[PDB]
């Protein structure tokens, strides 16, 4: 397998970049959900 070792390096690198894209996408979705959100400190969902 060491003669083909570049194939395993490319497979690992592509999966790592794909997972980095999923992490970056999840952060962007969370940022979109949190953008411009302002809450009262007095807000208690147990009563309200």
């Amino acid at each position: 397998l060491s003669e083909y070792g570049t194939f395993c390096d490319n497979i690992n690198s592509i999966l790592d970049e794909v997972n980095g894209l999923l992490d970056t996408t999840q952060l962007h979705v969370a940022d979109t959900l949190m953008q411009g959100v302002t809450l009262s400190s007095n807000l208690n969902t147990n009563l309200h």
Partner: protein
């Protein structure tokens, strides 16, 4: 020498197929990004 060279041809042709597949996927992402940039030019720069 034909047997040894055929092993190298298979490896190098597999390498090109893998690179070509990655390039097709990356250009699809670039086309999506370029459409977004054109939409941002039209809806944020030339108008609001």
């Amino acid at each position: 020498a034909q047997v040894q060279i055929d092993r190298l041809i298979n490896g190098r042709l597999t390498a090109l197929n893998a690179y070509v597949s990655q390039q097709l996927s990356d250009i699809s992402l670039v086309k999506f990004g370029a459409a977004l940039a054109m939409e941002k030019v039209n809806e944020c720069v030339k108008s609001q």
